[PDB]
Subunit: 391 residues, 2 copies
């Protein structure tokens, strides 16, 4: 009789957790791995008290969260069950959040138990992942739709929900960047999603956690470029660049394919006008452009990096990009002032030293000769020890 | 229109009477008549040179000057085989290098020839593997003369010195173009202890240029030897030659590092316990190495810039890259060595190693590896070298910035 005394204490405390906590620890000693028939039982017993006292007023909320927080490690869930947990706890909370920081810390405490886990085979089968999968998708989906929907009659109350959802999604991201980028992928294709998603994405990349290298696998990166190539809104595009810049050190491999794209992007951004703003694209694929009114990471950095790495082709692209475009089989979608290009670009170039590449490689060998990325192992290891010297 | 016959006259003229110009013009009319090499004609032509060499051989200087001047002009045309350079070696190259004509432009001409053999674009330029065969040969005899010549004890030195000087120059200039090759030729010789000092002598100089493509040297197995030399040999000079070589090549490996890591820790131990009176520690083991000591009875002149390559850098380079295991090793190395299943060969002074290596640690920032890995995850976990791709890019852009 160690279950039948914990359940006493549920009831006792869903009308100090001292007694509940105590009984949980003597439960975990007798059951260290999760027990499914005790999970089942206890799952049921909660369903029954939630009938008796629900999530309506805040003091019932505080309570329920403290409790769910301390008992959830003992349980085993699935897609069906988190649907219940979402429907009846997560959504209600987010949808109109209590103004107590602890109470939200607790909400997070529970969410992140489901989302982030060492062991995948912990609850049997795939279940631990499946739960996290759903939970992250519902969270994503709520934020996206909460970020667009016209807002009928509380504004401030709506800013409270995105303040919390962001904080949670960012937090998921720095730990799980392939996953959060996968969740954003269908949504990204729908214009008004874009400002919000990026707003969240840069905030993850700004931290430079691992393992951002994963992100391109998920096809998001590809999208983020399409946004920089085609979309219009100056606010959006500035997010898009800060993104593609900040991730560009954590690749060099996808660099081979996104090169010609990136050149064209440098072209677009260098050409940003006071009055006309950006040059609008023409081709656009089937991308369905974003315009502003439906009705300090500037291109300078992008230059440096393209002028390292691909200097010969870069300075051949600039000079005559329409030209460089045929011969490499692509199109310059944007109308653009050359002499202004040669001007700005040169100002920047004056600030750089001269490139050895010009002595070793041609423009043909610069694109094709992977022996060149030998020299990288060499100069990294040297620059690593120079970071560990204090003086 | 007759082509070859007029050139032989041109040739015969120019070896009895030092004006060339005529010959030069006869070579330019033939070359359009035969852009590729013609093996029926090389045949005839060497037949000719052979003839004229018994008539007017090498012997005095002035003859040499002329011989050289002329071979240089003609050698584009000819085709040699493994056996043919055995002529030129015995009849021309060897005569020269043993007692050399003290005339820079002469040696210049000689080198013109050699490196015309030694260095080339197309492997089938002569048919089959002949171009590369002569090459492989020449360098061999060069190497074998350089080694022989730098051990044979006694030609009033001043003669001998001019010999090795020339050879070195030539080997180094081969080295920097073809490191993979030259380090190949050096392995056997290197197993014989007195070749070491002279062989590292050349190799460190090649490495120092940091020309391409030093990564190729490990494949030869020469990297592994040099390490052996550092683990076992006694000779202060040879040793520092050794450490120099390995420090300046480590930056082009980071792959064999996963195979050399413990070796290197043992080396770091050993080079760090260097003593005024007892010098290096003695290698208890050796295996089948064949130790070299200084007085193997009972060059020299070690390059002054290679001095700054002391164990301090080995420390700095093992503190980055393998911070955890390195520091572990330097706490109880015997202990670390069981468990990682190798052996400490040296007697050493613990407290000294901790007094001294502390001194060096203190110069260094705290390592992040301590927050992200354990000792075993540090050793195995190939994702750690992903971060390196990103820091490499940022390291690059800030050198190309003029301020």
């Amino acid at each position: 009789m160690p279950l039948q005394s914990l359940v006493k204490a549920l009831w006792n405390v869903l009308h100090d957790l001292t007694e509940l906590i105590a009984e949980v620890e003597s439960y975990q000693q007798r059951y260290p791995k999760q027990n499914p028939t005790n999970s089942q039982k206890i799952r049921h017993i909660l369903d029954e008290i939630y009938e008796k006292t629900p999530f309506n007023n805040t003091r019932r909320r505080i309570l329920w969260l403290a409790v769910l927080k301390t008992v959830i490690p003992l349980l085993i869930l699935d897609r069906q069950a988190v649907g219940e947990w979402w429907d009846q706890i997560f959504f209600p909370f987010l949808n109109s959040p209590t103004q107590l920081k602890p109470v939200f810390s607790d909400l997070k405490s529970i969410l992140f138990y489901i989302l982030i886990f060492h062991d995948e085979d912990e609850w049997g089968g795939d279940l631990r992942r499946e739960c996290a999968e759903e939970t992250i998708t519902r969270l994503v989906d709520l934020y996206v739709s909460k970020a667009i929907e016209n807002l009928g009659d509380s504004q401030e109350q709506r800013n409270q929900t995105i303040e919390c959802l962001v904080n949670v999604l960012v937090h998921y991201g720095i730990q799980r960047p392939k996953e959060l980028s996968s969740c954003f992928c269908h949504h990204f294709l729908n214009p008004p999603t874009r400002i919000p998603i990026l707003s969240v994405m840069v905030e993850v990349i700004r931290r430079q956690g691992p393992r951002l290298y994963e992100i391109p696998q998920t096809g998001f990166y590809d999208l983020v470029l399409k946004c920089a190539e085609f979309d219009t809104s100056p606010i959006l595009l500035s997010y898009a660049l800060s993104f593609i810049l900040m991730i560009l050190s954590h690749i060099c491999n996808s660099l081979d394919d996104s090169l010609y794209r990136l050149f064209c992007i440098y072209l677009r951004f260098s050409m940003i006008d006071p009055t006309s703003g950006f040059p609008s694209s023409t081709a656009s694929g089937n991308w369905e452009v974003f315009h502003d009114f439906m009705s300090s990471l500037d291109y300078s950095q992008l230059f440096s990096i393209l002028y390292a790495l691909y200097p010969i082709n870069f300075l051949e692209f600039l000079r005559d990009p329409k030209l460089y475009a045929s011969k490499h089989n692509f199109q310059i979608r944007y109308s653009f002032n050359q002499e202004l290009l040669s001007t700005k670009s040169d100002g920047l170039l004056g600030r750089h030293l001269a490139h050895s590449n010009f002595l070793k490689y041609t423009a043909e060998t610069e694109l094709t000769d992977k022996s060149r990325w030998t020299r990288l192992d060499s100069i990294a290891v040297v620059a690593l020890c120079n970071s560990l010297n204090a003086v």
